[PDB]
RNA sequence: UUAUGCCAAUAGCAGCGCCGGGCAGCUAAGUUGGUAUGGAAGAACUGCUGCUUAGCGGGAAAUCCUUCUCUAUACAAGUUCUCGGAACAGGUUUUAGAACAGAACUUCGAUAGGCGGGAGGUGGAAGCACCGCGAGGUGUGAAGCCAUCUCGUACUAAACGA
RNA sequence: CAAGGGUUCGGUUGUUCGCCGAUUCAAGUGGUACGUGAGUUGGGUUUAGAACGUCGUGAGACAGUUCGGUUCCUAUCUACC
RNA sequence: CCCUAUGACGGGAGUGCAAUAGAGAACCUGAGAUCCGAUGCGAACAAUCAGUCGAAGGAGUAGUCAAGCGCACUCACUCUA
């Protein structure tokens, strides 16, 4: 739904810089703290720490994505709903088979910094787990990870 | 204990909302709410 | 239950929105007494047909009763008018399948339910107003000859310092009970007449003495 | 229906003297929700005057009091409403003030020479008819 | 002159109780001052009434004034003396209760430009 | 027991004065209705492939979806129709109710009262006639009354000229 | 492997425990300030009286026994309906 | 003396070195806690010894001065967050 999925940008700031994450389907961490910066705008100069200045950083298809050893089946999200005793528990393989996108939300999420500029950076964000993106018109940067990738190989 | 601002915050709620419609005598003086007996003619 | 009313293999049929008109006091052929109890279906007619393709959803606006211009607040004085349908006393919507999807202007009426199968009916329910427990939640209560000031009222959280202070979402006298309480999957319909178009139920259906009540499952 | 809290027997012994004051005099200033009370008795005690019987006048000899009342309705008060079907009292909302925020209402009967809304002529009711469920207005527009 | 000033002084009803209705009309028109006034039930309303109606009189006998062109701009309360007494409860414990007074004040201009805004409204 | 002189028929009071009844309302000792299916993941436990790394399938009143309830302050704050003197507000009630709230009615009107008709409860009114000295009985007479329920009628109070 | 739902009445004792009688699908083990008195009870037990046995040479004590022995709070806040 | 109030301690007029609402009667000077105000900014999606240090803002806005009547300085200044 064009409306339902182009989100509030018309709340941000726009003048600034549209730019894409297409992890490739490697890695979640990897792919996150990489988010977690451009996300955060650290990663330009004029940086000044009271204020948002995150560029718009958008990631596509999460479907394709790998999260390496065997944690899908065995690092569930834990979450409690208040009443007493409840503990709603959830594995990452249900999680992906409903929406592989809240998955690295909620990471992204709990990697930036904590304090109340999160949400109002995370109002900077967007996802669809395809390469389709009604985000195009506008001025998109696609863009690359750092060249930093030895990717050490095992027997 | 309770200072200015609770007292305040709950004494405010309580205000008092000027009334609506509110109909006068034409020419036997009394101002009323709807629905008085002020008069007849 | 299937092969009835007017559907293909398997969907929901709407739903159909009555009034509580009392109770009375059948018989069988096998010479027993079942209570029974009259819905009045006041001429319900379709009003808006819910569209995943325009809006998102599907759903037939069945309104039951019948109201004036005088009774109307304009803004659906409009609704109706638009739509050109014949006025009535309350709106509502049923989610129906794909299939089950009616013409805007198609009156309903009681020959649409099978007699001999369920229904559910939803009614918003009798409220009691501002009630405490032991009437809320059957709570007992502390004798009436030893205890005082607790006579007819209840305990206490678990508390101590751990659990520290923090009642959980327990249980405390409260304010009133209506609301709206399904009777799942009821017992089968009697009787439906095929003028009049009420319809007799063996018994237990929510709601006021009059004005309320919603028909499902079928 | 109301109780207007008072011992059930105190509450008649009180509603008895106020239809009956209302009778002697032709108005009286009370607070409302015990007007639209006494708007029950004066009427039932109208239809005394109407009826006007042996039995139906000794038994109006319990319900009013303190004076002789009793002959004002059986005397006048049928005889200025011999036709009136009905609708014996205006009950009307003056608020005047009080101390208590207590709402006043004058109450008083129809037909005088001033009243205070001057009222609808004394028409007989028409007789019966049959009620019926057709139930085939359909109000479109 | 301007902002023409009433007061009432010893007003034997408590201040909570009397600013509870000034603040009903503490910025609006006089005439509908006067007006929600006496069809507030509340009885300090008469005693805030007073004080406008003498307030809008000596606005008058004043002159530079149009008791028309008037609406109140200003006025509030303030506690006056208050001869406290003793207070008796249960077990010879005792206390104090103080009767209270106060003071009451109204400062009104001209409308001097606003008509144009009020229309508006 | 006190009053209406008395008879007659009523009233007050005895914390309904005490009895026998008692509709609507409420309740349960009464009556209903539920204690399911379907779907996924998957416990030990079980099998078979493998190719020695691995592959999948059954597999529990268990977990998660389907029913019921609540929900857009769901801040990515959602969608549809319609109103624009529109929504309110006030007044008579209410199947709803502590106020608020909801819902009904607001004079081209049944919103409540009132009056007529029934239903529904008590259970043979008074006066009159008879039988007996009386206590008292029988007829006139399912009489007499009426808390509620329905049904007729705007006769009262709910328009509105702020 | 499993906490989803359950886990009874009555007899003597203040009893927790426990014994018992009658039942059930079963009559679970601990935590929760040995949950819970600004919720209730107040029987035990730790005030003053009184008495029995024992100890003290008396005043008195008894981790022995029996009888009787005022239960305060108008909810600010957090929590919650 | 007038003016609105039931009634003025009120408001004017007036005496007075005093404006006497900064002597109006308990009456000089009149302070802090306390209360109601008026203005400017902030304030109903953001959690706590309530701040310190940074700080986008918003607002009220001064001056000197050759140079030209502006602009460009006074890190202008003051509140605010």
Redesign the pocket.
Known sequence: ?K??????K??NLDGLRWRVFDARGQVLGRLASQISTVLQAKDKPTY????DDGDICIVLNAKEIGFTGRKL?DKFYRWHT?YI??L????L??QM?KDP?EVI?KAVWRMLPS??LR??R??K???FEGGEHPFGDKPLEPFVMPPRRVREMRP | ????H???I??GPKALKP??????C?SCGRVK???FFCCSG | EAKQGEMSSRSKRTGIIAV?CGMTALWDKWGK???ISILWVDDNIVS?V??VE????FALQIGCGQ?????????????????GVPLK??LREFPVTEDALLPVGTSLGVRHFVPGQ?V?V?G????????G?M??H?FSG??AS?????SH???????????????????????????????????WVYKIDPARNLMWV????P??????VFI?DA | ?RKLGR????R??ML?TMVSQLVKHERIETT??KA?EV??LA??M??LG??GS???A??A???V?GDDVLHKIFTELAHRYKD??????????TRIRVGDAAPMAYIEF?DRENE??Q?????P???????LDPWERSRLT | ?QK????????KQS??KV?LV??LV??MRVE?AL?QLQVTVKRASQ?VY??I??????????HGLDPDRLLV???????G?FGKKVAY??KGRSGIISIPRC?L?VIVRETTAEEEAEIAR
């Open positions: 739904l409306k339902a999925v182009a989100g509030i018309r709340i000044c720490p009271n204020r089946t208040g005793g409840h709603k528990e959830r594995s393989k249900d088979a996108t939300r304090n109340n949400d109002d995370d109002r964000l967007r996802i | 204990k309770i200072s200015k609770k007292r305040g709950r004494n009334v609506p419609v509110i109909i006068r034409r709410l709807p629905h | 509580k007494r079942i209570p808006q819910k569209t325009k809006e998102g959803i109201k004036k211009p005088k009774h109307l607040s304009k803004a659906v004085v409009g609704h109706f008018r638009a739509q006393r309350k369920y559910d939803t918003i329910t009798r409220g009691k107003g501002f009630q427990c009437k809320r059957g502390m004798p030893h205890g005082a000031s607790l009222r209840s305990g206490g959280s678990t508390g101590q310092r751990d659990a520290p202070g923090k009642v959980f979402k327990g249980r405390k006298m409260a304010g009133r009970m209506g609301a709206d309480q399904r009777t799942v999957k009821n017992v063996r018994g237990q259906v709601g006021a003495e009059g004005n309320f499902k | 229906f011992p059930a027997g105190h008649m012994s008895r409302v929700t639209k708007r029950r009427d039932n109208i239809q109407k009826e042996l039995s139906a000794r038994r000899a319990g319900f009091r009136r079907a009905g609708g014996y009292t205006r009950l009307l909302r129809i205070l809304r009222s609808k002529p004394a028409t009711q028409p007789p019966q008819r049959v009620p | 002159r023409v000033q009433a007061v009432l002084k010893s007003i201040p909570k600013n000034a603040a503490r910025g509908d007006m005693t007073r004080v109606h003498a307030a809008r009189a000596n606005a008058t006998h004043n701009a200003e006025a509030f309360v303030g506690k003396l409860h249960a003071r004040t």
